[PDB]
Design a protein around this ligand. Structure first.
Ligand SMILES: Cn1nc(C(F)(F)F)cc1B(OC[C@H](O)CO)c1cc(C(F)(F)F)nn1C
Ligand SMILES: *[B-](O)(c1cc(C(F)(F)F)nn1C)c1cc(C(F)(F)F)nn1C
Ligand SMILES: Cn1nc(C(F)(F)F)cc1B(O)OC[C@H](O)CO
Ligand SMILES: Cn1nc(C(F)(F)F)cc1B(O)O
Ligand SMILES: Cn1nc(C(F)(F)F)cc1B(O)O
Ligand SMILES: Cn1nc(C(F)(F)F)cc1B(O)O
Lengths: 729, 403, 402
């Protein structure tokens, strides 16, 4: 019943109160404990104090304006509170969001207009505050975003976001466009969809425009001033209620469509959002809001939300703060970039480098090839014009920074080299020998490499201090990770310069010590090899692909194996067999190697050669190879689907632990974000390292349950699932 | 387990089609009252106070079919107020469940004479009009992996290897046998023509039938549940459970699936003492009933364990059954049933089925039951087994013996 | 023959209509919660032996459409072979499900059956399913449709039950329901409703007004005088009961059944089924019966149904220890008590629907289980459960403690 978090037996104050002579109260949120207003304990008590005062002085108040003194409006909550909420704290989680929404409900039914003066970003609880107002004005300034992104953290908008957006837009549009994926909107697009009512050019115009709207609203609509559409007698939900005949016909298809988009992945948040949305539309607003609180308590106290919150607020923020960047180094601005190779990798590196603002020289053997490399950026910009994202002016300046060439002399004045030709050490030696003297003396000598150690590649240049590995992922325009590999002779300054380059092009870096396979390629190898092993054991290929998708991977493993090429997977196994037999020992062949050779023997080595595990026609995938079931006698082995799923997840998790044991990675933050962004480890796990500490199965939870399950897989499928000593005691 | 239950009468209305149907102007309450009045016409001296209940199956008990339509039929027809009236819903088997419940009420010895059957006016009350505890609950819909009966039928055809020509061959078979049964006069005594309040004829035949159906015409039809699985994503949901299947072969159309029709059916069931007291000749005896089920999502493999359970319950085998009657919801379900139990082709749906004549959900069970009472008597055969697949994944079967 | 036994009989608390605790709970969830309680009591029960789930539901639309019995089977993870059928015989749907389950067991073709009902009247109001009468003026006009409320007032007029008489029964029902709750009679059978996080939603019957006074009941206005004039149902009723000049409207919201949400479940099986699964039988279903009376008064069906079930079991009134008749309206119970000369201290001894509510489809199974508990608490032998029904029907059941 109370607006406060405690009713017995001391927080700060984050809201400034101001009442003008016209009776308009301006609430300015200005949390003294940070640069951003956040839904912490101090805010709840501050808003509760203000809402109490709004009711106490209701005879002398004509309208309300909610504003912010920060660069943003309001974004987020106290994450240390949510991530520690245990299942036994579900009652307190439930009571907390009920108190939060009781404040907004009183602000909303005050009998007078409330306007949100959105000066900057309004994310999550920030937009929920604005949705409780009757009118929303946003300042169209650069960097501002509006949205409800809590589903990306495994949560849901538990401060009214679900209930109010469904009342505003209906079930289908609110779920698809706002809630299911937590889409962030620029102020212009937010006004288009109805999330915001008006726009102003500068933040200075916001509060005056709000009070002007309050004055006109009271004059033009005194009966419905301060009354939301859902609080009127004749309210009709857009698209209808679940009992309306039109929506009741398609409503059974909503969960199946959601299950199609997630491919059966165990992400409970979108399921909970859809349930709260539909169930809420069946009852009144206050009952709908209470249902929203219960589903929110289900997610907060769950394990998946704790995995996702761990990855974003602690791992990603530690990386973006410079956790893997060395200490003493400063800045070194980059003037001109030199990309060697015009394939899909080199052409992609030229696109993301030009889009950030750099001049790029794109070299290949011929101008014909380098021109088709720049054509990769032309066709990406041609689709960006038709979709309306970038303008006609900025696109012509983007392509103008890409200079296709075949002459090595055009690398004159290049201070950052990114080689991206064939995976061959002696070829990389020559291409850097032809180029190290034409470029600047301070230039970074970067090499996009999948497996070959950087220390060996550096012996083909003079200044090994500035040689470094810069691993990108195809397609480069869409993949967000850059795996930076530190060679044995690589300097600390070269790390920081490539670290800053990765941030400049809008990508996330990780720092990896030199080793065969690095982190991404080595770990993703255990993923594809685990599926090829299942294929050789006799498991149905369709079940293997379903296991990959239902585990949460972005691409099923056989489909991914056709794109990495089986000849490349072959000579990685040949190179690793030399990495042991030359040292004087015996090699332990992965059972997947026999499947790779049988497919090469049959002339089906992947998508490049026109046929692999899938058939290919007209440059597109055309289902599984019909002979694949006879070649491997598919159906003879029928393990449960969860065994196939666990075999793939545990292979990468155990291999991630090995990389942390050996020193390939130096922080679990790099391992988690690297596995998610680099190789597509399922976001619900929070990373291949978080997968261990946050494991959850029918036997238990945590590291001990991961060890127990890994021992079941080892007894049934092989010793590669036996956990390392670092996970034991 | 003592009192034997006997079938004394089993009648049904003709089945009117969905589009421009003759029964669209007829309230479903009127379809039941017409059958009650026909029972009076055949037995005028019957003491209706002996009738202790009227059990009607109805899958969409809403609108014209709401408010306990069985009790409405009792009051509207002028039956005694002591004759009860209960509506039940077990999806497609509602009509046979009403018959089985009536038989079990007689076996318990606490009911002596019961009317049973069903009613479904699908042109007035379409399927899904009642909403649904499942479809309105995304939290449960998401977890149980709901997939319509239609995608399960295509999935059954995909798994079992039934081609588009195979299911269309059965559809042609159903049209031919339904026409042969109508031409031969097999349905003359049990199909009660529907008449208005002036006695004028409304419908006297199953107007969904297409007797001139050809293999060529069936092959031209478009697969009807292909836009349902694309716009709803039900294909991907079905393959998430059946992960060893790569692609679903969509073979079912409007011409090899059951028809959307209007109709009703009534069956008079009672003890031997009830028949002797009122002078009723027993036509058949309810030997055994059974309720089971099978894989959900597929939804339609339920009739296989229910048939084995009712055979095991009556101490019989497949060889002891003279006639097999399985509702033709989809052609692949019948072909799977015929393949599983090795049912002889000459014994399966010998007078046609729902593909030709229609599937009035709540009434179909009692319609195909009465069809087998007539055909056992016409052939002078002994035993028949009647079963229907059901939504959700269940099945119901019944064995009758001619008397 | 095969005897039918009751092994478990539970129910949810009944949440009120206005600002009710159960308004946010889907009726499917009310049934699943009771299924989960049966599992907590028998975790080694082989659910494959359960062959059907029979639920009564008077308004099977919306949240209660699409065979909610089957939905509960799938939602709760019960075996797909466990069936699931919804039925509707108006107010006796809950007891009809139990009786049909018992007859299925006696027939020998079912071994273990779940039975009961569910009605979320705050989410699915009465009459939401339309109705073959209200949409058919030709038959409505002929059968002379009069709401059950006016028929209850008409029974009070013919029998001479005053406003003080029906209010005296209302006070008696509130007192005995309060005495039963405070005495712990309902502690083991009323299963509190909880949310997905385990938080409590409701653990008691909200509709109860244990501080009811006869002065407070007399201040209430007749609820069905506004219905009688706007529809002309008084005139329709007196056209059939032509010897009655005027209907005395004595029934209010205080002496009529409460509109509430609730559900109930009963486990019924053969002796071999209970022996095979380690279940201790609590009572035996001696006999069932159905009958009826005039459909304009509508609520006089209980008397011939009770008379019929007594003849069928070879018993009389003096052989029955407890009588349980649903408190749809106070005059219906007083009419029943007068007709069969039921001793006052044997009739609805733990209170009834006036105090606790009438969740249509579930009430029959609730008061059935209410007698299973009171027979074991008193160590009594026989109990007779019966309900009036819409349309003029009646259902009765006799149980014997074991
Ligand atoms: C970057 N980002 N910013 C938001 C913000 F809330 F600020 F809007 C949400 C995301 B986000 O999702 C990306 C979005 O789905 C588009 O692909 C993400 C990445 C991670 C990681 F830790 F695994 F890296 N965790 N999350 C929640
Ligand atoms: B309250 O102090 C709070 C939160 C919890 C819970 F366990 F549920 F997490 N229990 N209490 C008593 C509170 C609210 C918040 C905020 F972040 F603002 F939401 N933070 N705290 C500590
Ligand atoms: C994060 N996400 N949410 C959805 C939605 F909510 F709309 F269904 C879809 C996706 B998605 O990226 O598609 C692949 C998926 O992440 C793999 O499981
Ligand atoms: C601090 N913060 N919280 C959120 C969320 F999702 F909770 F609303 C988003 C952000 B952010 O982009 O900085
Ligand atoms: C930051 N925060 N903490 C909670 C909790 F756990 F206390 F309930 C809820 C929120 B929120 O709505 O952003
Ligand atoms: C793109 N999309 N996302 C969804 C969902 F379920 F995730 F919200 C539905 C669709 B659709 O088919 O338009």
């Amino acid at each position: 019943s109370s607006h406060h978090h405690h009713h017995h037996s001391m927080p700060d104050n984050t809201i400034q109160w101001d009442k003008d002579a016209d009776g308009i109260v301006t609430l300015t949120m200005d949390d003294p404990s940070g640069s951003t207003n956040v839904m912490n304990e101090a805010y709840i008590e501050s808003m509760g104090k203000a809402v109490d005062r709004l009711v106490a002085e209701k005879d002398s108040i004509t309208g309300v304006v909610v504003a912010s003194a920060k660069k943003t409006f309001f974004a987020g909550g106290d994450v240390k509170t949510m991530i520690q909420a245990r299942p036994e704290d579900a009652g307190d989680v439930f009571n907390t969001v009920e108190t939060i929404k009781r404040q907004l409900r009183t602000l909303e039914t005050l009998g007078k207009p409330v306007v949100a003066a959105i000066n900057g970003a309004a994310l999550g609880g920030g937009l929920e505050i604005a949705l409780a107002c009757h009118h929303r004005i946003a300042a169209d300034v650069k960097g501002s975003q509006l949205g409800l992104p809590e589903v990306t953290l495994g949560l849901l908008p538990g401060g009214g976001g679900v209930t109010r957006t469904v009342r505003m837009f209906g079930i289908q549009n609110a779920f698809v466009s706002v809630l299911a994926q937590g889409t962030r909107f620029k102020p212009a697009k937010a006004k288009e969809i109805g999330l915001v009512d008006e726009l102003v050019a500068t933040v200075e115009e916001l509060v005056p425009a709000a009070k002007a709207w309050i004055k006109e609203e009271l004059k033009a609509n005194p009966d419905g001033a301060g009354v939301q559409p859902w609080d009127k007698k004749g309210y009709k939900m857009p698209g209808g209620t679940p009992s309306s005949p039109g929506l009741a016909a398609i409503l059974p298809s909503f969960p199946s469509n959601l299950r199609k988009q997630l491919k059966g992945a165990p992400m409970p948040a979108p399921r909970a959002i859809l349930a709260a949305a539909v169930e809420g539309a069946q009852v009144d607003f206050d009952t709908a809001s209470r249902i929203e609180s219960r589903y929110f308590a289900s997610l907060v106290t769950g394990q998946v939300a704790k995995n996702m919150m761990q990855a974003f607020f602690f791992d990603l923020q530690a990386i973006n703060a410079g956790g893997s960047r060395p200490e003493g180094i400063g800045k070194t601005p980059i003037k001109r970039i030199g990309v060697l190779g015009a394939g899909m990798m080199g052409a992609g590196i030229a696109y993301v480098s030009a889009k950030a603002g750099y001049e790029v020289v794109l070299k290949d053997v011929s101008l014909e090839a380098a021109a088709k490399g720049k054509g990769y950026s032309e066709k990406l910009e041609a689709k960006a014009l038709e979709r309306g994202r970038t303008t006609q002016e900025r696109s012509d300046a983007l392509l103008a920074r890409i200079t296709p060439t075949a002459d090595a002399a055009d690398f004159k004045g290049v201070d950052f080299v990114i080689e991206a030709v064939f995976e061959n050490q002696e070829l990389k030696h020559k291409v850097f020998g032809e180029i190290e003297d034409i470029v600047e003396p301070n230039a970074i000598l970067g090499s996009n490499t999948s497996t070959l150690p950087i220390t060996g590649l550096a012996t083909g240049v003079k200044r090994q201090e500035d040689f470094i590995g810069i691993h990108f992922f195809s397609p480069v325009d869409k993949m967000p990770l850059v795996e930076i590999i530190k060679g044995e002779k690589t300097s600390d300054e070269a790390l920081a310069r490539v670290f800053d380059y990765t941030l400049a092009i809008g990508k996330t870096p990780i720092v990896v010590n030199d080793s065969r396979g690095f982190f991404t390629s080595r770990v993703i190898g255990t993923f594809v090899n685990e599926a090829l092993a299942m294929l050789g054991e006799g498991v149905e290929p369709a079940s293997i692909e379903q296991a990959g998708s239902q585990a949460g991977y972005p691409a099923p493993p056989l489909q991914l194996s056709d794109e990495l090429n089986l000849e490349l997977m072959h000579k990685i196994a040949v190179a690793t067999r030399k990495g042991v037999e030359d040292a004087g020992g015996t090699y332990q062949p992965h059972p997947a190697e026999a499947v790779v050779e049988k497919m090469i023997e049959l002339g089906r080595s992947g998508r490049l050669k026109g046929a692999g595990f899938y058939e290919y026609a007209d440059g597109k995938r055309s289902g599984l190879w019909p002979g694949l079931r006879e070649t491997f006698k598919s159906g003879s082995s029928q393990p449960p689907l969860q065994d196939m799923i666990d075999r793939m997840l545990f292979a990468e998790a155990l291999e991630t632990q090995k990389c942390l044991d050996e020193g390939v990675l130096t922080s679990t933050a790099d391992a988690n974000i690297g596995s998610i962004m680099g190789i597509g480890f399922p976001p619900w796990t929070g990373g291949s390292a978080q997968f261990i500490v946050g494991y959850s199965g029918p036997a238990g939870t945590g590291k001990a349950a991961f060890v127990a399950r890994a021992r079941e897989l080892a007894a049934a499928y092989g010793d590669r699932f036996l956990p390392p000593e670092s996970l034991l005691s | 387990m003592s009192e034997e239950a006997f079938i004394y009468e089993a009648i049904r209305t003709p089945r009117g089609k969905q589009k421009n149907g003759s029964l669209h102007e007829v309230k479903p309450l009127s379809l039941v009252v017409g059958l009650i009045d026909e029972l009076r016409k055949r037995h005028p001296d019957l003491d209706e106070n002996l009738i202790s209940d009227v059990i009607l199956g109805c899958v969409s008990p809403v609108g014209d079919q709401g408010g306990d339509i069985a009790r409405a039929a009792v009051l509207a027809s002028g039956m005694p107020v002591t004759s009860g009236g209960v509506q039940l819903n077990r999806f497609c088997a509602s009509g046979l469940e009403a018959v089985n419940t009536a038989a079990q009420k007689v076996r318990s010895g606490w009911d002596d004479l019961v009317l049973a059957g069903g009613v479904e006016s699908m042109s007035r009350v379409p399927m899904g009009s009642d909403g649904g505890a499942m479809g309105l609950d995304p939290a449960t819909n998401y977890d149980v992996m709901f997939v319509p009966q239609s995608i399960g039928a295509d999935l059954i055809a995909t798994i079992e290897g039934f081609s588009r020509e195979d299911v269309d061959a059965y559809a042609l078979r159903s049209q031919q046998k339904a026409a042969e049964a109508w031409s031969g006069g097999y349905f003359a005594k049990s199909v009660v023509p529907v008449r208005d309040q002036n006695g004028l004829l409304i419908l006297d035949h199953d107007e969904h039938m297409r007797p001139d159906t050809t293999k060529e015409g069936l092959a031209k039809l478009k697969p009807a549940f292909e836009g349902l699985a694309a716009l709803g994503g039900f294909d991907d949901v079905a393959l998430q459970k059946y992960h060893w299947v790569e692609k679903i072969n969509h073979v079912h159309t409007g011409g090899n699936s059951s028809g959307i029709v209007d109709g009703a059916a009534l069956v008079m069931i009672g003890s031997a003492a009830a028949g002797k007291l009122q002078g009723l000749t027993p036509r058949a005896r309810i030997v055994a009933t059974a309720t089971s089920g099978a894989d959900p999502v597929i939804m339609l493999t339920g009739p296989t364990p229910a048939t084995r359970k009712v055979l095991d319950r009556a101490g019989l085998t497949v060889d002891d059954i003279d006639l097999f009657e399985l509702n033709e919801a989809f052609a692949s379900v019948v072909l799977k049933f015929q393949k599983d139990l090795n049912i002889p082709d000459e014994k399966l749906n010998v007078n046609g089925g729902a593909i030709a004549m229609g599937h009035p959900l709540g009434a179909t069970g009692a319609m195909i039951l009465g069809t087998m009472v007539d055909e056992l008597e016409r052939r002078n055969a002994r035993r028949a087994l009647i079963t229907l697949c059901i939504g959700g994944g269940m099945g119901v079967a019944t064995i009758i013996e001619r008397v």
